[PDB]
Ligand binder design. Structure first.
Ligand SMILES: Brc1cnc2[nH]nnc2c1
Ligand SMILES: Brc1cnc2[nH]nnc2c1
Ligand SMILES: [Cl-]
Ligand SMILES: [Cl-]
Ligand SMILES: [Cl-]
Length: 348
């Protein structure tokens, strides 16, 4: 009784392996899932190649958001004719059985799959550097004035390997992306990767992606999310454990500062007071990235002790870049052009 029997109760297309669409696509299987709908692997008979097909939910709000996604993908792909800025390619789109379907090149698995494959030991610092450099080049591309595109949902799951053994990547899922000055949501980004200005209800720009990236890079090396909040209050407190209380010039303009913080008569800010007898977080800024990363103790959890490509100097450079990506102030947070110039990327 949903979509004349083609949909489940959650607006998704009921995927059947081997179904052929439009005398062109043979549906192999489901390969991904999301809030947007589903992704399937299919073979395009006409072009005689494998593709991934993202099936948007048969639901107006989701259709209308995916129309924005289509426009940003076609816009990016036309400024990336050489396909060298690490953004997935929208081959074409169509309506089928009342689902917007977007056809992409077939890609390998994502960076989360890669971490899980190491049993969350984390990938090497050399491989992290390759990912960071590609990622920064991609954000530089997004920042070109004709695009000014904010991805808004960078996470390990939305960065895909081109090929499962090689290190080339592409960013996918511009399903919540917007352009500078075309911002339409306040609840954005995945929580672990969510920036302070978004937690604070403040206006945001492309710099929220660089925040997400700094979280991602740490997690790729340690194996675990840097700020693993269960809800927004716990997310902001986890950030404060590592970075301290946010500067007053930020909190004074934050419409949601009172959700997490409290201003004292002298105008300084602290965390909201907790119920008497309840200790739950480390005191502000005492959980140091220096120790999260194991800079002088053999890498995260000491697991890198004795390996090449993991020197103390290597780690200090890494930490510095990460901390610059995690600047509380969006206006001084490091920007893609300067991140590429960081000493973490030199040499070899
Ligand atoms: Br290829 C590919 C795979 N997964 C995606 N999610 N959103 N866009 C995507 C493109
Ligand atoms: Br803020 C901040 C957080 N963690 C650190 N580790 N080493 N220096 C640091 C500065
Ligand atoms: Cl999702
Ligand atoms: Cl290596
Ligand atoms: Cl924690």
């Amino acid at each position: 009784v949903y979509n004349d029997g083609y949909d489940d109760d959650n607006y998704d297309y009921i995927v059947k392996n081997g179904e052929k669409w439009m005398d062109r696509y043979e549906i192999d299987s489901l390969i991904g899932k999301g809030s947007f709908g589903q992704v399937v692997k299919a073979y395009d008979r006409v072009e005689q190649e494998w593709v991934a097909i993202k099936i948007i939910k048969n639901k107006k709000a989701f259709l209308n958001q995916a129309q924005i996604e289509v426009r940003l993908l076609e816009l990016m792909n036309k400024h990336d004719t050489e396909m060298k800025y690490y953004i997935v390619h929208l081959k074409r789109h169509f309506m089928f059985r009342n689902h917007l379907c977007l056809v992409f090149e077939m890609l390998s698995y994502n960076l989360y799959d890669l971490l899980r494959n190491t049993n969350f030991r984390g990938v090497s610092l050399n491989l992290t550097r390759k990912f960071a450099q590609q990622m920064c080049t991609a954000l530089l591309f997004l920042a070109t004035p004709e695009l000014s595109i904010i991805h808004c949902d960078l996470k390990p799951e939305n960065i895909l390997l081109c090929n499962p053994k090689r290190s080339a990547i592409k960013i996918v899922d511009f399903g919540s992306s917007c352009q500078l000055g075309q911002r339409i949501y306040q609840y954005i980004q995945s929580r672990f990767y969510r920036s302070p200005e978004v937690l604070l209800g403040m206006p945001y720009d492309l710099a929220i992606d660089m925040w997400s990236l700094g979280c991602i890079l740490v997690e790729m090396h340690t194996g675990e999310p840097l700020f693993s909040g269960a809800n927004e209050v716990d997310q902001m407190n986890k950030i404060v454990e590592v970075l301290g209380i946010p500067p007053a010039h930020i909190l004074d303009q934050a419409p949601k500062a009172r959700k997490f913080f409290e201003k004292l008569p002298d105008g300084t800010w602290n965390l909201k007071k907790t119920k008497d007898g309840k200790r739950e977080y480390k005191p502000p800024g005492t959980r140091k990235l220096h120790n999260i990363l194991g800079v002088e103790t053999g890498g995260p959890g000491g697991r890198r002790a004795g390996e090449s490509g993991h020197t103390v100097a290597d780690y200090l450079k890494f930490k510095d870049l990460i901390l610059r990506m995690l600047d509380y102030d969006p206006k001084t947070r490091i920007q893609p052009y300067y991140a590429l110039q960081h000493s973490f990327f030199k040499k070899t």
